[PDB]
Amino acid sequence: LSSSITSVTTIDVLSSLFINLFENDLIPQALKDFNKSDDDQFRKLLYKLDLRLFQTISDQMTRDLKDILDINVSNNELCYQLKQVLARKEDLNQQIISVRNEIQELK
Amino acid sequence: SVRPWEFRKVIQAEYRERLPRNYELKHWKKPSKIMIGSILRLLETNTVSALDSVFEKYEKEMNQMTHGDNNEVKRIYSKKERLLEIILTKIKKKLRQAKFPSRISERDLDIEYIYSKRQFIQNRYSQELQNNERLEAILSREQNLLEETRKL
Amino acid sequence: QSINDRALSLLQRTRATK
């Protein structure tokens, strides 16, 4: 798994980057505004919209980057399986040649 | 000390937390346009989806705070759209300015690329498996012939 | 459910944007 590990890690780094941005910045600031807005019911609702908007985006970003990670990890395994089947193919070809050569000499 | 908007710093710290010290973390490069584009397309997709999601969920509360003025509701939708675009604009600016290890494959973040690669490698695997099935049969036929020949 | 299902769904959603 070492040839692809830095690329797989990149996907997790990005996912963590956006969880940090939304959950540890954008969403706390929207909360700080929404808790402070009990005098203006309109702005209270709008800050609530901000809250929900950032939380929805952040959760869905995490899901989509996990999708991308799962695809990559699955593809990498399939690529390695392909390498094995191709190694076996070359071996089967050589064995067929050797057995035919043997038949030719024993015939 | 590292603040969430300092993408270059966050990214380097996250790599260092996850992977041992070795060559891969020694050269660094600014990202490609398709990495930037793929990530911002994900963000935009989810931003539009969230906007529709959230405004539909709070439609009645909205319509009851605007006293039925749906024009004001479209205006608020546009205000929130603008807030999110200003955020996404800074995300794009800070990501363009960040650096990533040069050995990564940034195309791995592009769903179009990895989807087309997967379809191809699935097809290639199925073709090669069948070829090995056939070669196994041929080999078996030859090995039977050799056993008969060894016995003359 | 499947990885391909999830992949195609993401591909479709990103293409439908912009």
Numbering used by the authors:
A (entry chain B): 125 to 231
B (entry chain A): 124 to 275
C (entry chain C): 32 to 49
Article, verbatim:
We determined the crystal structure of the Cse4END peptide bound to a minimal Okp1‐Ame1 heterodimer. Crystals containing all three proteins, including the full Cse4END sequence, grew in space group P 42212 and yielded diffraction data to a minimum Bragg spacing of 1.8 Å. The ordered Cse4 residues in the crystal structure are mostly α‐helical (residues 34–46). The three‐way interface between Cse4, Okp1, and Ame1 has a hydrophobic core surrounded by polar interactions. Likewise, Cse4‐L41 and ‐I34 contact Ame1 I195. Cse4‐R37 makes complementary charge contacts with Ame1‐D191 and ‐D194. In the current structure, the Okp1‐Ame1 head tilts away from the shaft.
Kinetochores assemble at centromeres by interacting with a variant histone H3 known as centromere protein A (CENP‐A) in vertebrates and as Cse4 in Saccharomyces cerevisiae and other point‐centromere yeast. More recent biochemical reconstitution experiments showed that the Okp1‐Ame1 heterodimer, which is a Ctf19c sub‐module that binds the Ctf19 protein, is the direct binding partner of Cse4END (Anedchenko et al, 2019; Fischbock‐Halwachs et al, 2019; Hinshaw & Harrison, 2019).
